[PDB]
């Protein structure tokens, strides 16, 4: 069996939804049209409920029929392990209920994997669909016992080294280790019966659930990392006109989690919300093309849509499907097919995509989210999600300048190199940093790194103890000390001395006293920011939330201008970007075998002319779904259009 | 039925209608206050009261019953020739405003048995007793599945009912065990109360007042209730039950609430047991003090819809805690508010026109707006309990209510019926119309009935997600569309849009407001209708002698969300059989915030007209026969030919000569 | 020294002591506190930070703080605060169990025996922020105490006349349980220390006043405290009226205190980051406003929470008057100007007495209890919890914008036993519950010359939620009239009087009446909406529409001000300094010290205002002004956010 690699040819595919009641004729209609739509791959939920007989023995007939029809039309299968559960459980249970239930799951895996491993068209086991839940069942006897056990193996003091009170976040650290444990245990159960096939898993709702996910530990037992990125469930932090930015960030976040492993998007929205979804929609054809290009330009090795055909009963009946109710192509499948086709006509290019790293990394950490949950309310600086919305705003501001940026958990960043010249780290409202990471940040800047920090970055440590109160742990690196935070309106202006910038800011104004660092003053004569030279590199610190400020004002233009002014000149010379900020336009570049490309998407209401500067060579338009044209390096791109430029 | 009836009134479809009010009896009241109430009730041309027979105010420490407090009230009613609707109301907490809806326990069921034995044995002996109300406001949004009696009755119910997790074809299903149990449990307890009363009194009418009917209709099997009731009641409180409407459309609300009870009643007569008589202070969801104009509107709408009475809550007020000095028609000196003076003008009109008011029959246009329990049950499962709109609880009722409103503003009667209350057994349905507006659940059995109805000449109008699911929440739209035969077409996609969008038709530049979802179809036998974008959005199928119009976008919820039913009125009129518009009086065109409904009495035709607009309106009435003569008008309306000039808030009855 | 109504007032602040802090940091705090003209601190005596594994007490951490306070001549309010979870910010309000009650006995014995020995100890705070909306009826100690309470109290389900009743067992138990536990704490302290003042700080008083029997508390306290935090307690007001809020909060505690002196134990000293319901950072201008409003209302001190901040979790680096380098914020520099003014005017500031206009705005527990039962717990407005307090607070605001003092009292804190009430005024604004006993006291008050103003649903119910309006109006005698109807209307409507003199905003309900002895007042629509009754030497004005809630909802108190002034005895307007007319967002309140009269004026508007002060005697001289106010004759020109003290010569 073919193992996936960073050189595999990317695929477009879709969920094939198998339940009892379906006829051989309907199932074949689906696989035939899937193959005709230039799709290579399906995913199939291996429902234990539809394989278990009254007596307890397994009947594989319903799924044999589907696997055999996939094989006939040369379609390879991602098979999701999905034990018996309530019919009304849409997404599946995330952990065993009990020791008795764990044994039902052991028996389920033995039966399913032993049988279905024999099909030559099996491409992967999905160990579990959508691992992680906001609310873990601490009520249930299995989780209660595993948390009790976990606490006895971990010693915690109620005070720190200096004698101050601390929080230890026993619950949050247990939850990380419990996810690590059960996914590793599922991988091991599969490996008892099949060592030949790729192990995959699709983390979801990542801008809220990232605090459950230790992606570096997962790399030890996975072959590839998946994701669900549903416009209707996961992008609540954005308007629809910025789902481009949402999909870009979601992709960057999984890519970072994947590390040395290849990644793909296991779940994209293929169809209409009727009664389902939190932010319901029907993706436009234009949106299908945007989502596929953003994923592939971000190194994705596939895009699987949920779903090809629809469920028939209760939750989500006749929703999410790419085919209409006569089993023919919606404009969404016609659009997905144009991308399948582009791939088979440009195999060498699409098989070898590497993101063009600007060298900008936007870092988030679990501990900032844990501390925020303890200090806060659901809306905003004083609510759950500011610690993610803040980095997402820098991310958006850089997208509207046409620059790539990574989006990583801080443990996924490599702090071991000897040189970080022309590398940039943005810590936007990462309210919790400990001594160990401050040393890594000290090392990074010393060796040439640029560090940009805003909002309440470093206010607390990993124990929710504030060094701002006891003795500021970042005084050395920042070359300055915080004085006050004063709360203001939801939205206020930081007006810099000599009219250099008027910056939107959210909720709190910070004042500092500089020691080694160069002060920056506002028109009111207060010190609001500084630049510290620290070894070969530099630090820009502005302890007002200017990122949440741009988000709340719905204008990222001033955050874009400031951030560009702080970037090493090498980033702007070597990477294609926009001559200035463009509201609701995105660009992201990539390489394949030494050739550079640029993805451009216009999400504005009007035709835009973007001046692309930096990079090398003449823009040739390789892909454009609404007849964009270029004069020199000025691209004229229509609303909702996706453009790939090949630089010659 | 006549030896068993003896001297007691059997109410009938020929009974003389009454106006009446709740007389609120609690300890502390004096003989002088109680008499003041009954005296003024009689002087206000009211013939009837209702009295909550509080077990709490009759039970003694020892357990024996003391009837003194209620004897005093019944005797004073009899003195002023006032007949009593007596509500069975066992002992409960003082703070329990509406009363418990089911027994708590087997022990509690026996307290209720003993309560009924004592109260009915005693009070059946008064000659002025007109009716037993078996229970006040049967049904609750939230049933007590916690309590041991309900838990045991649901357990028992499930053991007597076998359900498969799959249908005939092999597909997964929901069975709605909870919802079907709740129907059968209401049927059971009301029937059991009726049987307890019948052990001791076979002479008097059994009555019950279902409430909040636009939300609670999925608890109510009215056809089964007919087996043990003599009349069907209702509560229709402007402050509790009309949340789906603004105040200026409480006319439409009261009209639909009346049509809904009338349909439930079938061969039984009905009356409105509970109307709002007075002011909300701290109580009510949408608080108000009814205007005099509103009291007259509500009474005429009910009588014109075959009601045999209107009982106001309340004549006098409660004195302590919940609703103290609220709801009363008398002021705090025990004299007439403008609300009682208004109610009295209607009592008087009745006693001066007895033959006419005793024989009212609604003039059926032949238009029937049908709802079903199962559409409400499936909606509750799909929306998972959101509360605002297509994607929330109540779209399945608001959609039919929009058609109903649009027909009211055209001056046409329409029935409002649960699908099981419609008669599908006739051989001819020429010039009959069925509207299925967003009835999202239809099974095979009912599709056959609809096929039969259209075949034999019926017109079927369907919009929104009608027929998307079956009674098991399985969607035939996905597996094989069960309505393909009747509609002569198949659905293609639903695409969600804004809260409010426009359906722009290919021809005549013509525009429908629509809510939430755009539906597209492929026609086989039916004639397609296309939009400007070249997609098929509606069709007309000729099926036997009758026709089907299908438009799977919600155009009814579309009119409701846009607060304009003018285009829904014009479209619906254009689909109607010509016979309906020739034989029934209606408006020459749509009139915003005006309502008309016609009725007959012994071969003479009448029309009720109410202006809820801000300005004097001149309505041209066409259809029917003869000269409009103004029989009733509370603000000096005049008519030149068939053009009525009617003032804001005015109620007019026209007699056709 | 024991506190008295002649004690010199102090400015002070919480000193927050927890493990981890160094001797050098603690000293920096006390040194700067002394340099900021502050004489006093409060210290939470955390049981958690004194208990050893073995169970014995180690006093080291607090010895260090007490000794450093003594070095800088700073006296200590010591809050009893037994062992509790680190995450419990405000502390438990009652013992969890009989076993827990014994841990608290042992805690008090150890802490009081030890710390009573320091010469700089000024007071024991028996418990921080007594009172909780929701009591732990779950927990075995409270369950047993409520069971016991019910067995000692017999209630009938009916009244004397035979009518059903509510008895409010829960609400009356809660009063008696607060009385009991605070008295029990006072007695435990007195086993070991009879030499030091006992203090307690009630909080969120506009919501929690129904938990507080202040007259009973006087029996065992030496002084009454209060928390009045802008970020937690002033939800019924916008920020531009926190002046009015602090004024009413002060009047409410002063009234509770009676013959006892009072002080504000907890004021907001600093910034909300993640904490607070209505978050802010007090301006320097706001610090000065709050201190002057409290002292002008007889406060003997203002203690800010906090001098220095907590370091971990809840409120870490929040609330502090010092910045993160341990130097003065503009808030501490402002507080210091007031400490300094005191030490330079000791005779004046030591003897402040409020100048009683004679206007008393009365609220009662029972109106709040009945409202909670009738609204069934809606939270927005006449049909929601808080109307019974918002209504009196609106009269209070309207009188503030006229420059008149008013008392704000629970009805049991008003003295009904005098023989003369000439030129005294009582306002009952939407006090929906009055019993026969209090109606007799009101009858007596008016007979003997009192003016009674009543609006909204005053007297609609009795203390058992029985409505005499329905059964036989208990206020017919005093009002000389009977209610006819209440009709619900819009949120906001206009009562337009027959005479073209008053158009009054009104909320929710229109009341109509029939007059017998009283003189009717008609509206343009011909309905009787109000009356004046002459009753003995005094008068009653009744208008049963809510005109106070009406002003609040319309954000205009100008018409309520003009009407109320027109009803006042001439003597109040001649003897008390007030404004020539209503001024939106300006407040004045006068006070005396040893026969000299003063006036506090605060401008909360966006612009310079010129207020004509009339009434009183003599020449306005500016004694205090933080933004160069001037007066020409009796016309004060006062800048936005400015606080002015006038000395009348
Ligand atoms: C991902 O999301 C889709 C859309 O709700 C689900 O149907 C699948 O179960 C999976 F959970
Ligand atoms: C109908 O509604 C009235 C008015 O609220 C209630 O008071 C009665 O109990 C009856 F339920
Ligand atoms: C008064 O207020 C402060 C601020 O929230 C609290 O920290 C203290 O515990 C006291 F409750
Ligand atoms: Cl799956
Ligand atoms: Cl009743
Ligand atoms: Cl304290």
From TrEMBL, chain B:
Species in which this protein is naturally found: Bacteroides salyersiae CL02T12C01
UniProt xrefs under SUPFAM superfamilies: (Trans)glycosidases, Class I glutamine amidotransferase-like
Superkingdom of the source species: Bacteria
PANTHER family the record matches: BETA-GALACTOSIDASE GANA, BETA-GALACTOSIDASE YESZ
Gene3D superfamilies hit by this protein: 3.40.50.880, Glycosidases
InterPro entries noted in UniProt: Beta_galactosidase_Trimer, Class_I_gatase-like, GH, Glyco_hydro_42
Molecular function terms, GO-annotated: beta-galactosidase activity
Family annotation (CDD domains): A4_beta-galactosidase_middle_domain
Listed name of the protein: Beta-galactosidase trimerisation domain-containing protein
GO biological process: carbohydrate metabolic process
Residue ranges annotated for the Beta-galactosidase trimerisation domain, each copy included: 367-553
């Amino acid at each position: 069996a073919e193992r996936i690699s960073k050189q595999s040819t990317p695929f477009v595919g879709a969920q094939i939804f198998i339940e009892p009641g379906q006829t051989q004729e309907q199932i074949e209609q689906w696989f035939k049209l899937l193959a005709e739509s230039n799709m290579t791959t399906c995913r199939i939920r291996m429902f234990g409920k539809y394989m278990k007989t009254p007596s307890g023995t397994y009947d594989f007939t319903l799924f044999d029929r589907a696997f055999k029809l996939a094989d006939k039309y040369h379609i390879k299968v991602y098979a999701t392990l999905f034990p018996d559960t309530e019919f009304t459980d849409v997404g599946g249970f995330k952990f065993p209920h009990s020791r008795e239930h764990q044994k039902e799951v052991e028996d389920y895996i033995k039966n399913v994997v032993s049988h279905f491993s024999q099909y030559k068209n099996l491409a992967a086991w999905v160990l579990i669909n959508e691992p992680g839940t906001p609310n873990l069942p601490f009520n249930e006897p299995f989780t209660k016992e595993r948390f009790s056990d976990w606490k006895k193996e971990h010693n915690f003091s109620e005070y720190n080294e200096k004698g101050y009170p601390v929080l230890n976040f026993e619950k949050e650290n247990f939850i990380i280790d419990y996810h690590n444990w059960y996914l590793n245990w599922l991988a091991n159960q599969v490996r008892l019966y099949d060592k030949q096939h790729d192990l995959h898993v699709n983390p979801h709702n990542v801008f809220k659930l990232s605090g459950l996910y230790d992606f570096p530990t997962w790399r030890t037992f996975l072959n590839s990392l998946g994701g669900s990125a549903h416009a209707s469930w996961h992008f609540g932090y954005f308007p629809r006109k910025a789902y481009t930015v949402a999909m870009s960030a979601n992709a960057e976040l999984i890519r970072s989690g994947a590390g040395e492993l290849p990644w793909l998007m296991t779940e994209l929205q293929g169809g209409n919300n009727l009664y389902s979804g939190a932010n319901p929609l029907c993706p436009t054809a234009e949106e299908i093309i945007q989502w596929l290009w953003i994923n592939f330009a971000t190194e994705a090795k596939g895009g699987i849509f949920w779903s090809f055909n629809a469920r028939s009963t209760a939750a989500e009946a006749g929703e999410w499907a790419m085919i209409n109710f006569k089993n023919k192509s919606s404009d969404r499948l016609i659009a997905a097919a144009t991308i399948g086709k582009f791939i088979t006509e440009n195999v060498k290019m699409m098989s070898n995509i590497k993101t063009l790293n600007s060298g900008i990394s936007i870092l988030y950490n679990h501990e900032s989210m844990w501390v925020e949950a303890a200090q806060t309310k659901l809306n905003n600086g004083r609510s759950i999600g500011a610690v993610m919305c803040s980095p997402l705003s820098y991310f958006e501001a850089l997208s509207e300048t046409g620059l790539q940026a990574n989006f990583k958990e801080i443990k996924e960043f490599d702090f071991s190199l000897n040189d970080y010249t022309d590398q940039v780290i943005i810590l936007s409202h990462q309210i919790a940093l400990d001594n160990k990471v401050i040393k890594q940040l000290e090392s990074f800047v010393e060796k040439g790194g640029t560090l940009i920090a805003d909002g309440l970055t470093g206010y607390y440590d990993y124990q929710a103890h504030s060094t701002v109160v006891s003795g500021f742990a970042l005084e050395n690196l920042f070359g300055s000390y915080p004085i006050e935070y004063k709360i203001k309106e939801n939205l206020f202006s930081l007006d810099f001395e000599k009219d250099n910038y008027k910056l939107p800011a959210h909720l709190w104004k910070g004042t500092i006293e500089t020691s080694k660092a160069t002060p920056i003053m506002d028109k009111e004569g207060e010190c609001i920011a500084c630049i510290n030279q620290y070894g070969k590199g530099k630090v820009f610190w502005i302890p007002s939330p200017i990122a949440l400020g741009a988000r709340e004002s719905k204008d990222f233009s001033e955050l874009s201008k400031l951030t560009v002014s702080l970037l090493p000149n090498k980033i702007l010379n070597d990477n294609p970007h926009f001559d200035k900020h463009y509201k609701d336009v995105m660009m992201k570049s990539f390489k394949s075998n030494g050739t550079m490309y640029s993805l451009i998407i216009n999400k504005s209401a009007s035709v835009q002319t973007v001046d692309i500067v930096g990079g090398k060579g003449k823009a040739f338009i390789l892909f454009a779904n609404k007849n964009a044209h270029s004069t020199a390096n000025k691209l004229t791109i229509s609303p909702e259009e996706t453009v790939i430029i090949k630089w010659k």
